[PDB]
C-alpha cells in the first residue's frame, strides 16, 4: 500500500509530530496504544448517525433559563427564513420541532441552516433548546435561517483501514549503574517507588564527586515486596547535589501487566527556575546530545512475572467521620482521619462525597489492602446510581489517583454528560490525560469517543491536542497517539477542513514571527505587513477556513487595509477577515489577533473557567454577562485570539481626556458611555449591562485570584459590557485590591466617593448572589483551580499558591459570614480609589 501510505505523511502534518517514529521509546507502549485505540474509533465511526453527524446540531437539555422566558413575548419566538432575498418571518412556539417549522412553511427534503454560520437547526429538539437560538434571545436578536440542502453524509466517510507477581516475597530492587552527562559539586541518585503521589519506598546511593560520568554499580533494595507493587507504580529517579537537578520515571508494571526487567538507559528531564504534571511523565527526554542520562538494571529472572488481575458505629465517631467527608478537596487528611475512613469504609461507601478521601486512605503499597479496595469497588451501587457530580468526578481524575479502576469509575460517571457539558470540561479532561499512568486509559478512549461522535467536540479536541503536542515534550507522544486515532475517524470531510485551517494559520505565524524580528512601530514594518498579506492571498492559501476558536465561522479574504502590527513589547498582528459566507446578514470583519512570546495555554484555562462560572450562574438564573472571548494556542509560545467588537481599553478612555498621566478622572467613563449611546434608553441598558458585567468580573476575578489588574488590561464595549483580557500576563509574571472597582466604575453606578445609589445596591446584590452561587460549587472550582495550576502554569504550584482559593471561597464559613465577607472586599475597593491603579501606572509604564 502507498496511496494509503502517503496518508500518514498528511496525518504527521496535521498532528505536528511523527507518531510512527521510535527514536525515543524504551518499550512498545505507544505502538500498543495505537493498536489499542483502533477498536474504540471504529466502534464509534460505525455507531454514529450519518445525518446528525454531518450537521452537528448544537443542542442542550438544560431548561431554558428564567431570564430568557421573560424575553419571549408570549409563547412566541420569531424566526426569519431566508430563501434568496425573498425573506419571510414566522411565529414559532418555543416547543416547536425544527422539521415542524417546515410542515408550517411547506404550507405557504430541505434543512434550515443559520445565516452566516455552519450551524443547523436539525433533529428532534425544541428550538428553545438550540444554543444559537439561546444566544439570539440572550443578546436580543432576530433568528435568521437560510433554508437549504443537507450536507452529504458520504463526505464524512472514513477511508479503509509466566510467574504470578503475587508469589514473590523478595524485596524489590534496582541497580544503579550510574549516570553520564556530556557536559557540566557532589552528587547522588534518589530512587522512589510512587503510586498516586504517595511514596511507597525510598533509597539513595552514596554521594560521589560530580564528573562527566559517575558509576556506583550498587543494588538498591527497597523495603517493598515484588507482590506488593500496585499497577501504576512508578520508579522515580532523581539526581541531587541540596538541590534537585534531573528526574525520570519508569512504570514498574508495563501495559501488559509484566514486572519490568532488563537494562534501561533513560535520558532525563531537567529542572528550571511543589509539583506540576510534567514531573509525572513516563516519557523520556528526546534530546540526547544534551540530557543527563541514567543507567539501571532490574532483576531479570527467566521469567515473566505478570501482575495477576460493615456493622454499627458509636456517635462521636460518626460525627467525626461526617466532619471528614464534608471538608474540601484540598484539606489534608491526618493518619488519624485515614485509619477512620478505612475502618469505616463500608459506611463510607454510601456517600459518593467520601470517595476521594476514602480512596486516599488506601495504602496502595499493600496487596491485601488493594485487594480489599477492589471488593469495595464491587459494592459500588450508590455511586453508580447518584446524579453526576463533575466536582467528584474530576477529583478521582487528578494526580492523586494512580489505580485505573478508581479512575475508571469517574470516567463511567462522565459517559452520561450531554455534548454541551462535555464542551464545558473538554479542555480540562484533556489536561487530565497527563495524570493517567498509561497511554491507553478510559479517559483517553472516552475523549476519542465523544470527539468522533460530534464534530464540534471533535474540532476543539483537535486543537487542544495539537497545542499540547506542539509545546510539551513530556506528553506529546501520548497526545500524538490520541490525535492520530481521532483523525483516522473524524471523516475525510473533517480531515480536509483541518488541513485548510492548518495551512492558513501556519502561514500567518510565519508573518507574525517575521514582523516580530523588526523592532513602537516603524512605517517600514507597517509596509511589509501589507505586502506579505498580499503574497498570501495568492495561489497557496485556500479560499476560506474555519476560525478555530469559533468553529461555526468561515473566514475568507483578509482585509489588508485594516490589518496592523501593534505596539506591544512583542509585535502581535491585528488581522481582519471577511466572512467567507455570502449568507452573512452583516459585513463586519472577523477580527483575530496573532501573538508570539506568550504561552496562551494559561489564558485558555482561565477563559474556560469563566465559561464554567457563567454556566454555574445560569443554574441560579443569573447572567453576569462575561465576555470569555475565543483564544486558541496553536504552537510553541504562539497562537491567536478573538477580537471583541466595539471595544476600547478603560485606560484608553482615560488617556483620551487626561493623556498618559494618572490624573484619572472619576467621571470620564460614564461620559464615554453617554458619548456612544444613540438613546438614553440604550444608555440605561449599557449602564445595566455594566453593573452586571462588572460585578460578574469582580467575583470570578476575585475567586481566581487575578483581580488586581492594570487599567490597560480591562476593556469595555460601546454597549456597556466590560471584560478583562490578557490573563497570562498576571499569571505568568507572578498595596492591593481584591478585584478592580474604581472611582470611574462607581461613578457609572450612581455613587460618589463614599455614597450609595440604586445601581450600586443592585451591584452589591448581584455580587452576593454571584459569590454565594459559586460557593455552592466549592468542590468543582477547587479541583479545577488545582488542576489548572498543575497542568497549565508551573512555577505557580508550590502548594501555597494552590490553596489561595479556599480562602477566597471562604470554605467553612456559613453564607451570612460569607455574604458579609465579599461586601467587605467591595469596601476595600472603595477605600483605595486610584492608589493601586496609579501604582500599576508607575510600575508598568515607568518601572
Task: Consult the annotation and say whether 724 binds a ligand.
Answer: yes
Task: Consult the annotation and say whether 36 binds a ligand.
Answer: no
Task: Consult the annotation and say whether 591 binds a ligand.
Answer: yes
Q: 259 or 714: whose CB is closer to ligand ML9?
A: 714
Cα–Cα distance measured from residue 552 to residue 707, given in angstroms and rounded to the nearest whole number = 32
Task: Consult the annotation and say whether 705 binds a ligand.
Answer: no
Q: Which residues of 79-113 are buried (b: 16+ CB within 10 A; e: fewer)?
A: bebbeeeeeeebebebebbbbebbeebeeeeebbb
The β-bridge relationship of strands 234-240 and 186-195 is antiparallel
Least CB distance to ligand ML9 at residue 57 (A) = 28
Nearest-CB residue to ligand ML9?
A: 644
Task: Consult the annotation and say whether 373 binds a ligand.
Answer: no
Annotate each residue in 680-719 with x if it binds ligand ML9 (CB under 6 A) or - if it does not, as one string: -----------------------------------x----
Least CB distance to ligand ML9 at residue 732 (A) = 9
Q: Does 643 bind ligand ML9 (CB under 6 A)?
A: yes
Least CB distance to ligand ML9 at residue 626 (A) = 12
Q: Does 845 bind ligand ML9 (CB under 6 A)?
A: no
Task: Consult the annotation and say whether 595 binds a ligand.
Answer: yes
Other beta carbons less than 10 A from residue 622's beta carbon? 21
Task: Consult the annotation and say whether 95 binds a ligand.
Answer: no
Q: 497 or 642: whose CB is closer to ligand ML9?
A: 642
Task: Consult the annotation and say whether 782 binds a ligand.
Answer: no
Name, in order, each residue with C-beta under 8 angstroms of 682's C-beta and a sequence gap of 6 or more.
719
Least CB distance to ligand ML9 at residue 687 (A) = 20
Name, in order, each residue with C-beta under 8 angstroms of 714's C-beta and a sequence gap of 6 or more.
649, 650, 651, 722, 723, 724, 725, 740
Cα angle 135, 137, 138 (rounded to 5 degrees) comes to: 65
Task: Consult the annotation and say whether 597 binds a ligand.
Answer: yes
Cα–Cα distance measured from residue 600 to residue 607, given in angstroms and rounded to the nearest whole number = 11
Q: Does 618 bind ligand ML9 (CB under 6 A)?
A: no
Q: 228 or 642: whose CB is closer to ligand ML9?
A: 642
Count of residues making up the chain? 847
Task: Consult the annotation and say whether 120 binds a ligand.
Answer: no
Cα angle 61, 65, 71 (rounded to 5 degrees) comes to: 125
Least CB distance to ligand ML9 at residue 706 (A) = 12
Q: Does 622 bind ligand ML9 (CB under 6 A)?
A: no
Stretch that binds ligand ML9, among 117-125, 198-206, 217-225, 640-648 (CB under 6 A): 640-648
Among 156, 278, 576, 642, binds ligand ML9 (CB under 6 A): 642
Q: What is the DSSP letter of 658?
A: T
Q: Which residues in the 552-611 window bind ligand ML9 by CB under 6 A?
A: 566, 593, 595, 598, 600, 603
Q: Locate 647 and state its grid cell.
A: 471595544
Q: Which residues in the 347-366 window bind ligand ML9 by CB under 6 A?
A: none
Least CB distance to ligand ML9 at residue 695 (A) = 20
User: Distances in Å between the alpha carbon of 47 and those of 50, 154, 515, 556?
Assistant: 9, 15, 48, 34
Annotate each residue in 714-733 with x if it binds ligand ML9 (CB under 6 A) or - if it does not, as one string: -x---------xx-x-----
Least CB distance to ligand ML9 at residue 460 (A) = 18
Task: Consult the annotation and say whether 728 binds a ligand.
Answer: yes
The β-bridge relationship of strands 143-145 and 77-81 is parallel
Name which of 178, 175, 252 is nearest 220 in CA terms.
Answer: 175
Task: Consult the annotation and say whether 729 binds a ligand.
Answer: yes
Q: 82 or 596: whose CB is closer to ligand ML9?
A: 596
Q: Which residues of 539-576 are buried (b: 16+ CB within 10 A; e: fewer)?
A: eebeebbbbbbbbbbbbbebebeebebeebeebbbebb
Q: Does 548 bind ligand ML9 (CB under 6 A)?
A: no
Q: 637 or 682: whose CB is closer to ligand ML9?
A: 637
Q: Does 652 bind ligand ML9 (CB under 6 A)?
A: yes
Among 641, 669, 714, 722, binds ligand ML9 (CB under 6 A): 641
Q: Which residues of 248-258 are buried (b: 16+ CB within 10 A; e: fewer)?
A: bbbbbbbbeeb
User: Distances in Å between the alpha carbon of 246 and those of 239, 264, 575?
Assistant: 5, 16, 43
User: Distances in Å between the alpha carbon of 273 and those of 185, 270, 282, 454?
Assistant: 19, 10, 22, 41
Give the orientation angle of helix 680-703 with respect to helix 758-775, to 10 degrees: 40
Q: Locate 717 and state its grid cell.
A: 464595549
Q: 513 or 643: whose CB is closer to ligand ML9?
A: 643
Q: Contact, 650 vs 557, CB < 8 A?
A: no
> SS3 helix, strand, coil % of the chain, rounded to 5?
45, 15, 40
Annotate each residue in 8-37 with x if it binds ligand ML9 (CB under 6 A) or - if it does not, as one string: ------------------------------
Number of residues that bind ligand ML9 (CB under 6 A): 18
Cα–Cα distance measured from residue 330 to residue 395, given in angstroms and rounded to the nearest whole number = 10
Name which of 561, 623, 515 is nearest 135 in CA terms.
Answer: 623
Task: Consult the annotation and say whether 254 binds a ligand.
Answer: no
Task: Consult the annotation and say whether 731 binds a ligand.
Answer: yes
Peptide bond into 605 cis (omega under 30): no
Stretch that binds ligand ML9, among 357-365, 604-612, 637-645, 745-753 (CB under 6 A): 637-645
Q: 533 or 809: whose CB is closer to ligand ML9?
A: 533
Q: 405 or 648: whose CB is closer to ligand ML9?
A: 648
Least CB distance to ligand ML9 at residue 647 (A) = 4
Task: Consult the annotation and say whether 629 binds a ligand.
Answer: yes
Task: Consult the annotation and say whether 178 binds a ligand.
Answer: no
Residues at the interface with ligand ML9 (CB under 6 A)? 566, 593, 595, 598, 600, 603, 629, 641-644, 647, 649, 652, 715, 725-726, 728
Binding-site annotation: residue ranges for ATP:
591-600, 626-634, 723-731
Binding-site annotation: residue ranges:
591-600, 626-634, 723-731
Amino acid at each position: 500500500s502507498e496511496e494509503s501510505q502517503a496518508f500518514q505523511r498528511q496525518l504527521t502534518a496535521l498532528i505536528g509530530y511523527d507518531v510512527t517514529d521510535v527514536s525515543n521509546v524504551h518499550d512498545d507502549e505507544l505502538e500498543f496504544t495505537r493498536r489499542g485505540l483502533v477498536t474504540p474509533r471504529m466502534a464509534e465511526v460505525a455507531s454514529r448517525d450519518p445525518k446528525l453527524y454531518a450537521m452537528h446540531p448544537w443542542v442542550t437539555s438544560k431548561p431554558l433559563p428564567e431570564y430568557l422566558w421573560k424575553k419571549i413575548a408570549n409563547n412566541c419566538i420569531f424566526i426569519v427564513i431566508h430563501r434568496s432575498t425573498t425573506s419571510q418571518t414566522i411565529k414559532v412556539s418555543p416547543d416547536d420541532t425544527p422539521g415542524a417549522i417546515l410542515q408550517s412553511f411547506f404550507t405557504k427534503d430541505f434543512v434550515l441552516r443559520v445565516c452566516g454560520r455552519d450551524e443547523y437547526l436539525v433533529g428532534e429538539t425544541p428550538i428553545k433548546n438550540f444554543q444559537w437560538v439561546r444566544h439570539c434571545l440572550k443578546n436580543g436578536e432576530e433568528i435568521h435561517v437560510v433554508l437549504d440542502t443537507p450536507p452529504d453524509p458520504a463526505l464524512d466517510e472514513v477511508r479503509k483501514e509466566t510467574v504470578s507477581l503475587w508469589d514473590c516475597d523478595r524485596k524489590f530492587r534496582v541497580k544503579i549503574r550510574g549516570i553520564d552527562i556530556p557536559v557540566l559539586l557532589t552528587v547522588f541518585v534518589e530512587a522512589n517507588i510512587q503510586h498516586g503521589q504517595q511514596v511507597l519506598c525510598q533509597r539513595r546511593t552514596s554521594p560521589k564527586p560530580f564528573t562527566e560520568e559517575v558509576l556506583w554499580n550498587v543494588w538498591l533494595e527497597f523495603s517493598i515486596k515484588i507482590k506488593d507493587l500496585p499497577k501504576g507504580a512508578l520508579l522515580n529517579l532523581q539526581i541531587y547535589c541540596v538541590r534537585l537537578l534531573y528526574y525520570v520515571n519508569l512504570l514498574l508494571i508495563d501495559h501488559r501487566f509484566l514486572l519490568r526487567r532488563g537494562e534501561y538507559v533513560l535520558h532525563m528531564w531537567q529542572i528550571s527556575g511543589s509539583f506540576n504534571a510534567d514531573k509525572l511523565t513516563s516519557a523520556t527526554n528526546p534530546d540526547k546530545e544534551n540530557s543527563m542520562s541514567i543507567s539501571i538494571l532490574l532483576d531479570n529472572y527467566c521469567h515473566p512475572i505478570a501482575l495477576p488481575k460493615r456493622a454499627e458505629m458509636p456517635n462521636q465517631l460518626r460525627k467525626q467521620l461526617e466532619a471528614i467527608i464534608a471538608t474540601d478537596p484540598l484539606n489534608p487528611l491526618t493518619a488519624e482521619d485515614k485509619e477512620l475512613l478505612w475502618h469505616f469504609r463500608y459506611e463510607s461507601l454510601k456517600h459518593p462525597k467520601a470517595y476521594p478521601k476514602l480512596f486516599s486512605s488506601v495504602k496502595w503499597g499493600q496487596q491485601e489492602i488493594v485487594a480489599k479496595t477492589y471488593q469495595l469497588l464491587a459494592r459500588r451501587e450508590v455511586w453508580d446510581q447518584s446524579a453526576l457530580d463533575v466536582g467528584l468526578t474530576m477529583q478521582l481524575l487528578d494526580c492523586n489517583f494512580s489505580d485505573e479502576n478508581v479512575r475508571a469509575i469517574a470516567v463511567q460517571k462522565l459517559e452520561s454528560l450531554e455534548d454541551d457539558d462535555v464542551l464545558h470540561y473538554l479542555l480540562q479532561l484533556v489536561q487530565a490525560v497527563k495524570f493517567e499512568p498509561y497511554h491507553d486509559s478510559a479517559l483517553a478512549r472516552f475523549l476519542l469517543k465523544r470527539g468522533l461522535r460530534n464534530k464540534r467536540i471533535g474540532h476543539f479536541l483537535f486543537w487542544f491536542l495539537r497545542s499540547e503536542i506542539a509545546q510539551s515534550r513530556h506528553y506529546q507522544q501520548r497526545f500524538a497517539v490520541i490525535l492520530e486515532a481521532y483523525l483516522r475517524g473524524c471523516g475525510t470531510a473533517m480531515l480536509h477542513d483541518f488541513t485548510q485551517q492548518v495551512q492558513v494559520i501556519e502561514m500567518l505565524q510565519k508573518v507574525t514571527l517575521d514582523i516580530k524580528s523588526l523592532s513602537d512601530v516603524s512605517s517600514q514594518v507597517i509596509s511589509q505587513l501589507k505586502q506579505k498579506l498580499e503574497n498570501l492571498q495568492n495561489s497557496q492559501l485556500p479560499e476560506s477556513f474555519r476560525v478555530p476558536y469559533d468553529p461555526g465561522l468561515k473566514a475568507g479574504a483578509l482585509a489588508i487595509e485594516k490589518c496592523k502590527v501593534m505596539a506591544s513589547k512583542k509585535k502581535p498582528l491585528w488581522l481582519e477577515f471577511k466572512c467567507a459566507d455570502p449568507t452573512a446578514l452583516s459585513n463586519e470583519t472577523i477580527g483575530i489577533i496573532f501573538k508570539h512570546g506568550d504561552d496562551l495555554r494559561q489564558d485558555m484555562l482561565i477563559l474556560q473557567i469563566l465559561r464554567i462560572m457563567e454556566s454555574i450562574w445560569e443554574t441560579e438564573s443569573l447572567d453576569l454577562c462575561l465576555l470569555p472571548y475565543g483564544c486558541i494556542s496553536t504552537g510553541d509560545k504562539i497562537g491567536m485570539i478573538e477580537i471583541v467588537k466595539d471595544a476600547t481599553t478603560i485606560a484608553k478612555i482615560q488617556q483620551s481626556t487626561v493623556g498618559n498621566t494618572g490624573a484619572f478622572k472619576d467621571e470620564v467613563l460614564n461620559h464615554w458611555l453617554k458619548e456612544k449611546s444613540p438613546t438614553e434608553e440604550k444608555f440605561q441598558a449599557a449602564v445595566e449591562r455594566f453593573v452586571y458585567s462588572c460585578a460578574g468580573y469582580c467575583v470570578a476575578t476575585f475567586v481566581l485570584g487575578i483581580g488586581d489588574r492594570h487599567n490597560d488590561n480591562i476593556m469595555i464595549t460601546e454597549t456597556g459590557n466590560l471584560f478583562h483580557i490578557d490573563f497570562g500576563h498576571i499569571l505568568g509574571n507572578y498595596e492591593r485590591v481584591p478585584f478592580v472597582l474604581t472611582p470611574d466604575f462607581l461613578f457609572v453606578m450612581g455613587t460618589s466617593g463614599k455614597k450609595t445609589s440604586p445601581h450600586f445596591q443592585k451591584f452589591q446584590d448581584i455580587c452576593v448572589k454571584a459569590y454565594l452561587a459559586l460557593r455552592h460549587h466549592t468542590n468543582l472550582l477547587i479541583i479545577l483551580f488545582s488542576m489548572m495550576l498543575m497542568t497549565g502554569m508551573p512555577q505557580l504550584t508550590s502548594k501555597e499558591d494552590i490553596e489561595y482559593i479556599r480562602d477566597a471561597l471562604t470554605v467553612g464559613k456559613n453564607e451570612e459570614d460569607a455574604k458579609k465577607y465579599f461586601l467587605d472586599q467591595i469596601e476595600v475597593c472603595r477605600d483605595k480609589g486610584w492608589t493601586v491603579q496609579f501604582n500599576w501606572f508607575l510600575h508598568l509604564v515607568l518601572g
